[PDB]
Amino acid sequence: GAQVSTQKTGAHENQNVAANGSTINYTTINYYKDSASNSATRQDLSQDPSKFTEPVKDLMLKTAPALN
């Protein structure tokens, strides 16, 4: 019941696409009943900066004057 994922690239690896070669492949099995025992999660690169940098109720555009 192993899961697999793409390994992060290294010195002799392919381009940043990481799509070239089935050989880039880390395989893992969880051995414990509590998921707290599992290794760390997959990188989550999802980002949402607007929450902190642009939490404006009004719709603000960058080209529009900020004021008006």
Partner: protein, 281 residues
């Protein structure tokens, strides 16, 4: 199947206007002649290959790159010897740097293995408990510990290995970490450009790759408190490049190295042996 070296084809006597045996070295091209062009040859089949000399194989072994010295001191002095901070480099070792220096540029991942060994250097031998060592990497820009018991050994971000003496030699993989796309073995340049308003004495270590090499330091300490009976621990650091590509090949140094760069010692300017004559085989 893997490629083999080329086979030699069978040949016979030749009388033609072809000149495979003649050339013009001046063009910068190497001669292209092979035995089949110059002498009568038989068909042979070559199953021999060149994997043994591929770059991954050439650079496929770990080498000792430095020696660190750690001491557990029961004396009022030498507390400072409980830890050792070394600049990370491979230039302390001539066999490894000479191999790497075959190329102007290189790109590789690196793995490190450490070997610990210790003795009881004093005449007053006695019981010492099994010791544990911490190998902490201190990245460039990170603070250095002032002491083996300095708070920076907390290692909240700085990665480190805790090794108990007697277990398998500790080991870790390091990814390529250059800020360039390739590591530079040589650098004909200066870290900073002196400008017109500056003093004409404008050397002061700015010249050479050394001035642009900051890979942090490796800080190793015993992790215990002093024991009445002291210990001298020698740590040998081993390095092996992995997944290596190189570019722009260059000839190796024939003389002993002087320091970090390509500086020469006057005592080793004459690397080759003499012979009795041109005509001695």
């Amino acid at each position: 199947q893997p490629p083999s070296t080329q086979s030699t084809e069978a040949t016979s006597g030749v009388n033609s206007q072809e000149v495979p045996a003649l050339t013009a070295v001046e063009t910068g091209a190497s001669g292209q002649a092979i035995p089949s062009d110059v002498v009568e040859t038989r068909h042979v089949v070559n199953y021999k290959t060149r994997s043994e000399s591929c770059l991954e194989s050439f650079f496929g072994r770990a080498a000792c790159v430095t020696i660190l010295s750690l001491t557990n001191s029961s004396k009022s002095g030498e507390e400072k010897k409980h830890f050792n901070i070394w600049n990370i480099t491979y230039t302390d070792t001539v066999q490894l740097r000479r191999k790497l220096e075959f190329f102007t540029y290189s790109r590789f991942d690196l793995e490190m293995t450490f070997v610990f060994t210790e003795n009881y250097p004093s005449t007053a031998s006695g019981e010492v408990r099994n010791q544990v060592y911490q190998i902490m990497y201190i990245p460039p820009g990170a603070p250095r510990p002032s002491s083996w018991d300095d708070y920076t050994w907390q290692s909240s971000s700085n990665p480190s290995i805790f090794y108990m003496y007697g277990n398998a030699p500790p080991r870790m993989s390091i990814p390529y970490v250059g800020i360039a796309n390739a590591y530079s073995h040589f650098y004909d340049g200066f870290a900073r450009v002196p400008l017109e308003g500056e003093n004409t004495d404008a050397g002061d270590t700015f010249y050479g790759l050394v001035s642009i090499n900051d890979f942090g330091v490796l800080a190793v300490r015993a992790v215990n408190r002093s024991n009445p009976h002291t210990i001298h621990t020698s740590v040998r650091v081993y390095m092996k490049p992995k997944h290596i590509r190189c570019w722009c090949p260059r000839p190796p140094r024939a003389v002993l190295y002087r320091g970090e760069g390509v500086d020469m010692i006057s005592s080793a300017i004459l690397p080759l042996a003499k012979v009795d004559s041109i005509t001695t085989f």
